[model samples]
Target chain A: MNGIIVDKEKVHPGMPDVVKDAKIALLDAPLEIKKPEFDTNLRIEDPSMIQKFLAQEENMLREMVDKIKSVGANVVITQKGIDDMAQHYLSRAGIYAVRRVKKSDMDKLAKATGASIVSTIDEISSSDLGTAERVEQVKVGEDYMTFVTGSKNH
Target chain B: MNGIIVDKEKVHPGMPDVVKDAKIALLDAPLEIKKPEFDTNLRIEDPSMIQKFLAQEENMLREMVDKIKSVGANVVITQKGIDDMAQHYLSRAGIYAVRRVKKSDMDKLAKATGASIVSTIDEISSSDLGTAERVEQVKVGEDYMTFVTGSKNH
Candidate 1:
């Protein structure tokens, strides 16, 4: 079958445990907020500057989540970590997301879902989306696992 | 069986077609000489500078091959391309080198050889080596393929 199961659970509890008619976006890049290159050298002299900096970072992450949504992705699988803020945004969008997935798992997901694994948020588009008939979370023994089913490939 | 047959050939005809008691080094990085960041900015005011630049690049590639030998690796498999000069050095060292290997094949090689896939030359050490009873080129149909055999895992 084209579908496959992933040995991972959603990154946030607020995310939907199940997503049907999955249009999956597979990313090799982290969804976490980008860190400043000169983080150590930077110091905020004003409290307002800190707020503005935080707002910019959060807004960037929000845009990343929005891009996934705009690409028609209902399911997101990434080989890297998802930031807490990004997780919240994804959860609010009613998206299903799993983070820090193994490389092999990501590869298999791409094959099963017919989705291309993108390395950047800007690379994501509807054309890069992979399809699955159903994607759901199932408890396997003591752990919750993700199952992407009804794919055409075995 | 831990053995795997890769659908690839040696980069240079001078390379050995077979290697026994193979100690393999799997690299994710290219064995090619590093490119200049200031490619367009580079200008040789004197004929001597041109020769010096060429010599430096070839020397660096040689050192990379030497590092592979120093680590006791007689077989080299890389996911990226090997430079022509690098291939020559490896051939002279009697190392069976294959370049531009698929990521899946490289992963399988790591698993079969018990060798870690290193990303940098400095990371090449004996501990990073993977062992196999034999690693040889086999003519499959009309093409030559690499077979890594007698590994402990399947």
Candidate 2:
């Protein structure tokens, strides 16, 4: 249990069953529908506005997913739930994703990859990215699970 | 490496440098004083209720911690803050505890330890626990980091 830093050369770049250096993103913000804290009565003039609203939401989700892919993120750890649209897109894109995680373990994740927590999508950039060799999803019994395995920069 | 069924014995029971089979608990609920969403002023019919109220919160924290210990959970990964009182008690119980963890990482912890995420302390039992070979905080760079190692269903 000597928690000493091992020589870089001695450290294997990747561990067995590890998906090494897979780009990782820990999102604190919600990927779900954005709603105001308090309910406000909106004046609906037409029924087509509802359709537009739905399309707008879908468009926003697509934008988010595109951004994720652009950053080369293979894993997405969301603090809140991932919308159905986003989930389907994310899966189709071949990304390892999990949503609605404990708000506090954010530190554990930030440490795991030594990456900063991106609160807003506007601030998301390459710097917001993190790396992990064992960040992948594997089926455990009947359940699918993820791994935040061996990563450096600690 | 093929992500399929392999030799179970060849699977590492505990990860490299892990303590193995460390029962872990990933809690998403807050272990602090619960606040009402709306500002409802409490009418103080008797000032003693204030003391009882504070005591009640403290007692709840103790019970939660006690349940964790009783379940043989050596590792407690909380998504919310652990009050000072609860922290002291948890340490005294010789438990490895981390709080304010990212809510999203609860899934990561569950996956890591194969531990169940218990919501209500009232219904908490050992059956709702997960296992790990190692789940403790280690000094990494100037901060302490927690690890729930091993990649098995043990």
Candidate 3:
């Protein structure tokens, strides 16, 4: 089984270190992370672009869903550009969307979303992120900070 | 959009690398290789295990076929431990099986199967051993290193 993790945070404090470590642990073969362009500006001037974006996103989501359904792992998308419509589309495709929550709200988010891993910017370290277990963390500024840990197998 | 390359030697040596690379690159996750163990293995010493293997493999294949039918892809399995009775059961489940073939017979296999991507160990890289694409390759292995690509979408 395989999966994708998408993070949407400007100056993600923990991203670089976390991803760098993941690349090493996952090796050059198995496991991968795809960083989709995050348009913080939310600049939508052309209607055609909306269609194009939706089409492209839908195709990408569909492909991910197919792979997951075929292989039996879940794709985890982090906070960014996620909206009600995107959530609905992803739900229909059987993809799991995980939004980043503040450290104070980690428990609440976990309860709400049933996510075991919680992350914070300050906790982004090799010891925290580099483990066989699944760690869900927050992207503070190019760094992926871990807040909690749980089983990697889902 | 991602598929395993089966019967690579059979493909024209000069064939555009893009053709093969594209198939491999579409895979977003690591390959998951499942070797049949005592829990999953069909041992001749235990007739029940063999029966269980056939039943489990058939069920998995059927589920795959149903998913494919719902979407666009088709399920093709290369028989290994399946007997005539098991084949009949699989046929009833809408799962198709094929005979095993050698790498040298890819052209004939392609012509006979009309598969866009060949599904053989020789056609796939070790990296593709246990992912969704690998599942597709396994289907090909069960079907005599056959191929099963999606049909043209209208």
Candidate 4:
């Protein structure tokens, strides 16, 4: 009730799922994203910028998670290219992340952002399969480096 | 960082696309829905309860929209028979009604609730197509009802 009233009609491709059976199911759900707010950050396109952002004080991660949590978001849905460091940071900050936003997340994001063509990573070609496999390989090698938080029961 | 760190190795569904890519394309996209959840108070198996609820709401021709909206849900995704009033309420809610839960929502709900078989209405059958057609009929009759939410920029 003390949260944003997203109109599901406006969902974009990359948004999160917010409605079920035509009702807002993710309402008042906890938010725990460990990234800069969309408004405060520069474009995350440049590798150096990303590196610098990642290298900054660890408090930045806490701040990011706090911001998302303050908004009552329970999941921190991400897109295709999220790196290991970011994923690790989010895990440390107690946020859940998926490689690409789900249809439900897309619906929620579309309702929240009003973007239409939010491309999904699922549309990746066979050529892109290598990238996915590579990511998985990295994950496998770095099993000890993973992080997570929050009540796993919920 | 002032955040708690949890093991990422324990991260289930390691990557989002790994799960999303496994699903169909257009079928996986988010469907437009409305706000204000609907009440599922009537017992699906009890025809008397359904009749009682419908009669209390004063049939489908009356101010059923207000009644449904008051319940705080959008569509009524169900397989069993619903009263005309319930059907009308769902029609007004908009497109994207399924007899069963979509695989995507089902998976997410399983992750969220940790229950493998949560009941949802995201998926419908060919037999349910008749209900959809009837809803379309209602829309055709209401000339004032708009389909798309806004004007396309492109």
Quick one: best TM-score, which candidate? 1
Give one digit per residue, the lDDT tens place, for model 1 in B89-150.
57667678888899888887787779999899886789999999989888898998998897
For A25-97, candidate 2 gives per-residue lDDT tens digits of 8888777543211111242544334334444655687688778878888677777667544654454454556
Model 2: per-residue Cα lDDT at residue B132: 62
Clashing pairs in 1: A1-A153, A1-A154, A2-A153, B2-B153
Per-residue C-alpha lDDT of model 1 across residues A1-154, encoded as one tens digit per residue: 3456789987656455567788988888877654332121144444234324444665787788888888889889889888755665576566788899998888877776679999988966899988888898878999988988876654
lDDT tens digits, residue span A62-142, model 4: 455455445433344443334433333333333334444345654544344222322332232222110000010012342
Give the alpha carbon lDDT tens digit for every residue of B103-126 in model 3.
444343334333433243233333
Instruction: List candidate 4 stretches off by more than 4 Å.
Output: A1-54, A57-62, A102-105, A108-154, B1-154
* Alpha-carbon deviation at B109 in model 1, angstroms: 1.3
TM-score of every candidate relative to the true structure: 0.46, 0.40, 0.19, 0.19
DockQ of 2: 0.01
Provide the lDDT at A88 for model 3.
33
| Per-residue lDDT over B81-151 for candidate 4, one digit per residue giving the tens place of the 0 to 100 score | 33222332333332223333345543432332222231222333222211111111012342311111111
TM-score of chain A of each: 0.87, 0.75, 0.28, 0.30
